[PDB]
Amino acid sequence: MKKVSVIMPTFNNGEKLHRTISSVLNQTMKSTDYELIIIDDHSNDNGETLNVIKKYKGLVRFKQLKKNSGNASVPRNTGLKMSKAEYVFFLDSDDLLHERALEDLYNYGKENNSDLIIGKYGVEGKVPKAIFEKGNVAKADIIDNSIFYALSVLKMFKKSVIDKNKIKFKTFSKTAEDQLFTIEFLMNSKNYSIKTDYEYYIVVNSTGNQYFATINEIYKAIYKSPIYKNQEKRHQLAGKYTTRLLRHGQKKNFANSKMKYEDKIEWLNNFSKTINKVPRDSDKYVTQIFNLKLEAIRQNDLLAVMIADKLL
Amino acid sequence: MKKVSVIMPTFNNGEKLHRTISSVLNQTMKSTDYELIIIDDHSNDNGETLNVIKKYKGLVRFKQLKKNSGNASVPRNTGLKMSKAEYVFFLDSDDLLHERALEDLYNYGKENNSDLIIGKYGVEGKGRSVPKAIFEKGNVAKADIIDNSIFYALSVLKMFKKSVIDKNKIKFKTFSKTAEDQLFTIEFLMNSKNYSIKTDYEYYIVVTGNQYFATINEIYKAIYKSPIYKNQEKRHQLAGKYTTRLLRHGQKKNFANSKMKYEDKIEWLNNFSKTINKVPRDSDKYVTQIFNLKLEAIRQNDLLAVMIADKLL
Amino acid sequence: MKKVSVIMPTFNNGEKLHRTISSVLNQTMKSTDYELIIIDDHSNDNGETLNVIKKYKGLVRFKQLKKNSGNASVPRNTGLKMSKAEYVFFLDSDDLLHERALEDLYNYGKENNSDLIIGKYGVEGKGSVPKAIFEKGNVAKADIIDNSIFYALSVLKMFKKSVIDKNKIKFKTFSKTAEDQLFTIEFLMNSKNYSIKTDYEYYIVVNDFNQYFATINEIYKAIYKSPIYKNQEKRHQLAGKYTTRLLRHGQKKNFANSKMKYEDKIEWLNNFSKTINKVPRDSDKYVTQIFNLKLEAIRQNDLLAVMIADKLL
Ligand SMILES: [Cl-]
Ligand SMILES: [Cl-]
Ligand SMILES: [Cl-]
Ligand SMILES: [Cl-]
Ligand SMILES: [Cl-]
Ligand SMILES: [Cl-]
Ligand SMILES: [Cl-]
Ligand SMILES: [Cl-]
Ligand SMILES: [Cl-]
Ligand SMILES: [Cl-]
Ligand SMILES: [Mg+2]
Ligand SMILES: [Mg+2]
Q: What is the DSSP string of A214-270?
A: HHHHHHHHHHT-SSS--HHHHHHHHHHHHHHHHHH-TTTT-TTSS--HHHHHHHHHH
Burial C83-96 (b: 16+ CB within 10 A, else e): bebbbbbbbbbbbb
The DSSP code sequence of A87-132 is: EEEE--TT-EE-TTHHHHHHHHHHHTT-SEEEEPEEEE-----GGG
Q: How far apart are CA A76 and CA A162, in angstroms?
A: 12
CB-based contact B90:B76 (threshold 8 Å): yes
Work out the minimum CA distance from B304 to partner chain A, whole angstroms. Answer: 7
Question: Is C143 known to be catalytic?
Answer: no
Tell me if C138 sits within 8 A of C196, measured CB to CB: yes
Distance CA C21, CA C36 (A): 8
* d(C-alpha A36, C-alpha A29), whole Å: 13
Per DSSP bridges, beta strands C158-160 and C116-119 are antiparallel
Round to whole Å and give the CA distance between A82 and A289. Answer: 47
Strands B204-206 and B96-97 come out as antiparallel
Q: Which ranges in C206-279 belong to alpha helices (H)?
A: 212-224, 232-249, 262-276
Q: What is the DSSP string of C145-162?
A: TTTTGGG---S-SEEEHH
**Cα C101 to the chain's mean position, in Å?**
18
Cβ atoms of B273 and B301 closer than 8 Å: yes
CA atoms of B107 and B30, how far apart (whole Å): 13
B262 vs A284: CB contact, 8 Å cut-off? no
Instruction: Out of C180, C264, C282, C310, pick the active-site residue.
Output: C180
C259/B contact by beta carbon, under 8 A: yes
Task: Report which of B214, B202, B154 is spatially closest to residue B181, judged by C-alpha positions.
Answer: B154
Residue B119 φ/ψ, nearest 5 degrees: -95, 145
Give A305 to chain C, closest Cα distance, Å: 11
Whether residue A60 contacts residue A21, with contact meaning beta carbons closer than 8 Å, is answered with yes
Which residue, among C82, C100, C99, C80, has the nearest Cα to C90 in the 3D structure? C80
**C262 and B285 in contact by Cβ < 8 A?**
no
Centre a 10 Å sphere on the Cβ of residue A115 and count the other Cβ atoms it contains: 22
Asked if residue C179 lies in contact with residue C71, where contact means CB atoms within 8 angstroms, the answer is yes
Q: Are B172 and B90 in contact (CB under 8 A)?
A: no
Q: Which residues contact C180 (CB under 8 A, 6 or more apart)?
A: C72, C153, C154, C155, C171
SS3 A45: coil
The residues, any chain, with a CB within 8 Å of residue C64's CB and separated by 6 or more, are C39, C40, C42, C43, C50
Write out chain A residues lying below 8 Å of C240, CB-based: none
CATH class of A4-209: alpha beta
- Is the Cβ–Cβ distance between C245 and C150 less than 8 Å? yes
* Three-class secondary structure of residue C293 per DSSP: helix
Sign of torsion over alpha carbons B78, B79, B85, B87: negative
Cβ neighbours, 10 Å, residue A72: 23
Q: How far is A178 from chain C, CA to nearest CA, in Å? A: 35
In sequence order, which ranges of C112-229 are alpha helices (DSSP H)?
Answer: 161-166, 179-188, 212-224
Number of CB atoms found within 10 A of residue A302's CB: 22
Query: How is domain C4-210 classified at the CATH fold level?
Result: Spore Coat Polysaccharide Biosynthesis Protein SpsA; Chain A (3.90.550)
Which resolution, in Å, applies to this structure?
1.9
Collapsing DSSP to helix, strand or coil, B107 comes out as helix
Instruction: Return the SS3 of A7.
Output: strand
Nearest Cα neighbor of C121 from C142, C105, C141 is C105
- Among residues A40, A95, A178, A283, the one annotated as catalytic is A178
Q: In 3-state terms, chain B is what percent helix, strand and coil (to 5)?
A: 45, 15, 40
In this complex, which chains have at least 3 CB pairs below 8 Å with chain A? B, C
Among residues A76, A117, A78, A90, the alpha carbon closest in space to that of A24 is found at: A90
Test the A interface: residue of C292, C298, C301 with most A CBs within 10 Å: C292
- Asked if A101 and A156 count as a contact pair (C-beta separation under 8 A), the reply is no
Please give the C-alpha separations between residue C270 and each of A101, C241, C259, C283, in angstroms, as whole numbers.
65, 22, 17, 20
With beta carbons under 8 A apart, name residues in chain C contacting B281: 261-263
Which residues make beta-bridge pairs with B135?
A: none
Cβ-based contacts of C257 with chain B (< 8 Å): 292-293
